[PDB]
Amino acid sequence: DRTPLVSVLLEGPPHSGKTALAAKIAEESNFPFIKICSPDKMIGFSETAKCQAMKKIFDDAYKSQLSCVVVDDIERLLDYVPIGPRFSNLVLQALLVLLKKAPPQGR
Amino acid sequence: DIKELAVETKNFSGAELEGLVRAAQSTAMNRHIKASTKVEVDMEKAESLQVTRGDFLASLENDIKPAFGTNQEDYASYIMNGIIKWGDPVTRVLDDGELLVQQTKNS
Ligand SMILES: Nc1ncnc2c1ncn2[C@@H]1O[C@H](COP(=O)(O)OP(=O)(O)OP(=O)(O)O)[C@@H](O)[C@H]1O
C-alpha cells in the first residue's frame, strides 16, 4: 500500500534468452492489462515519434486497477553505438522521468 | 458556521461559492426521495428539512473543485507518506524555512 509502483531489471550476456523469461513472468502475473512495448514496431521513427508512442502506451495503462508493462532491449530503444558514443538524449530523459510518475491514486 | 467555510474555501470565485450552496441543498431533498421502482416524495418528513455541516463537508470533498492555484490533489501526491520526526535535522530545516518566509514577508 505504501509502494504502488515497483520496477525491476533483467540483465545478462547476449543470446541468454531473457525476453522470453520476462514474457513468461508477465503472462503468469494474471493481471487484467498486459502490454509489450518493443522496438520492432517503430522502425525508422524520429525520436519525437518514439516519445509520443511510449507516452500513449503508458497512458493506456493508467485506466485499470492492475497493470504490467515490459520494456524490451533498452539499448536498441536509445539508438546506442560504441563509437563516439552516440545516442538519443530526448528518449533517455523521457524514460528517466517516466520511471517515477505514480499513477492516479488507488491503482 | 460561516467563518469555517470562508476560511477553508480558498481560490474560490463567486460562481463556485453559489454552486457549493446549491449542491449542499440538494443532498437533503435527495435524502427524502426514494427512487427504486417509482419516484415517491415522502411528505411525512418533508416538514423537517434541515441542512447540516456534514452535507457541506461532503459537497466540498466530492462535487465542487476550483479551477485555479494548487489544491489538495497535489499535496496528496507529493507528500505521499507524510513527515516523521526521526531526528534533529528535520526541525532545523523547518526552522530555517520559517525564518526565510518571515524575512520575505517583512523586509
Ligand atoms: N529455458 C529457456 N529460457 C529461455 N528461453 C528459452 C528456454 N528454452 C528455450 N528457450 C527459447 O530460446 C529463445 C530465447 O531467445 P530470446 O529472444 O529470448 O533471447 P534474447 O536474449 O532476447 O536475445 P538477444 O539477447 O540476442 O536479443 C526463445 O525461442 C525461447 O523460447
Side-chain angles (χ1 to χ4, degrees), chain A residues 63-83:
Chain A
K63 285 185 283 201
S64 301
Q65 300 291 129
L66 270 164
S67 300
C68 177
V69 182
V70 184
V71 179
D72 190 75
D73 284 330
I74 287 160
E75 67 257 9
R76 281 285 86 72
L77 209 76
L78 304 179
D79 294 311
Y80 177 84
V81 60
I83 303 175

Side-chain angles (χ1 to χ4, degrees), chain A residues 2 4, chain B residues 80-81:
Chain A
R2 285 191 251 269
Chain B
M80 160 162 316
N81 295 313

